[PDB]
Design a protein around this ligand. Sequence first.
Ligand SMILES: Cc1ccc(-n2nc(C(C)(C)C)cc2NC(=O)N[C@H]2CC[C@H](Oc3ccc4nnc(C(C)C)n4c3)c3ccccc32)cc1
Ligand SMILES: Fc1ccc(-c2c[nH]nc2-c2ccnc(F)c2)cc1
Length: 327
Amino acid sequence: RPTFYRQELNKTIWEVPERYQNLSPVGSGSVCAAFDTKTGLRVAVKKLSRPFQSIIHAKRTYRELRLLKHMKHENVIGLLDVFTPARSLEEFNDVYLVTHLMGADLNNILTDDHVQFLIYQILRGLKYIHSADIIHRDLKPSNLAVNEDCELKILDFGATRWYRAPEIMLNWMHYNQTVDIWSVGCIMAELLTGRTLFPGTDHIDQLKLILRLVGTPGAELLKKISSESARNYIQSLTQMPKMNFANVFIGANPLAVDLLEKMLVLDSDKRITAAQALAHAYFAQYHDPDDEPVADPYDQSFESRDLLIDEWKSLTYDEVISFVPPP
Ligand SMILES: Cc1ccc(-n2nc(C(C)(C)C)cc2NC(=O)N[C@H]2CC[C@H](Oc3ccc4nnc(C(C)C)n4c3)c3ccccc32)cc1
Ligand SMILES: Fc1ccc(-c2c[nH]nc2-c2ccnc(F)c2)cc1
C-alpha cells in the first residue's frame, strides 16, 4: 500500500500517493495536473466531491468508476490509476481518478485537413462508445481533450443546449445514439466556419434556430410524435423548408458539407451512424476499417437497481480494489 501525503489546493484537500507530484489545479469534483514519477507522464487527477452524499451521488460514483474501468480506446478517456487514502471499507469516503493529461480542450483549439483529423478521431471514439451501448448525451468542445499533437479523447466533465439534439430539447424519452452524431455535426460546423451553429438562448430558441436550417418536420417524422402538446407547438410554427447546405456552408470542402448533411438530418432515424461516418470519403486519408475497434461487452444492468448508499459504496470499493493498471 503506497504512502499518501496531504495538501490543500483552493479550499479542497488532496491526499494522493507520493508517486504523484507538483499537483496544480486545472478546473473546478475538482481536477489537478500532476507529475507521475512512476512513468514520467503528466496526469490529470479527479477527486470526487462527497461521493456518498446521497443514493444518486453514490450511484454516480459507481457509474463513473465502472465506465472509466471499461473504456480502453485511443480516442476515449481511460484510467491509469484509481485510489483512496482509506485502508478499510468502513472509512472509505474519497475516490480519486487518474488519466493521461492532454492539456487543452477543443474550445482552446484550422485547415480542412485539421478538421478531417479532429472529426475522424471523435467518430472513431464514438464508434467504440456506441458499440458498448452507451450514449454520451453531452458531446461539446469542452468535453473533447486535445494534446499538442492534435490527438483527441472524448471525456465527460459533467451552453450544453447549443450541441444538443432537437429531440432532446423536445423532451422525447426514446432518443437513440444518433443524438451524439447531431452534436458532432454541430462541432464540425463550428470548426469549419468559426461560429456556433445554433447559439440558442433557451430550449424554445434552440429548437427555432435548428428548424430554420433543417426545416420543420415532414409527414414521416410527424407520424412518430406521440405528444399532442409537442405536435401542437411544432405544427403551429411558420413551416420552414430544409436549407441548401451547399449555400449555408459555401467555402467549406464540399465533401465536408455532404457529411454535415448526413449528420444533421432532423429525423434521428435517418442520421448517419458513427461506423458509417468513418467510411465517408471525407476521411479517406485517415479511415482504416482494421484500426477502428469496438468495445468488449459492458454490463450496465446496475442502472435499473435501487440500492442503499452503503451498497453503492461497497460495490465502488470492490471496483477500486480489483483495479489493474494498463501496461
Ligand atoms: C457521473 C459520470 C461522470 C462522467 C462520466 N464519464 N463518462 C465518460 C465517457 C462517456 C466514457 C466519455 C467519461 C467520464 N468521466 C470523465 O471523463 N472523467 C474525467 C472528467 C475530466 C477530468 O479531467 C481531465 C482529464 C484529462 C484531461 N486532459 N486534458 C484535460 C483538460 C486540459 C481539459 N483533461 C481533463 C478527469 C480527470 C481524471 C479522471 C477522469 C476525468 C461518467 C459518469
Ligand atoms: F420538432 C421536432 C420534431 C421531432 C424531432 C425528432 C427528431 N428525431 N426524432 C424526433 C422525435 C421522434 C419521436 N418523438 C418525438 F417527440 C421526436 C425533433 C424536433
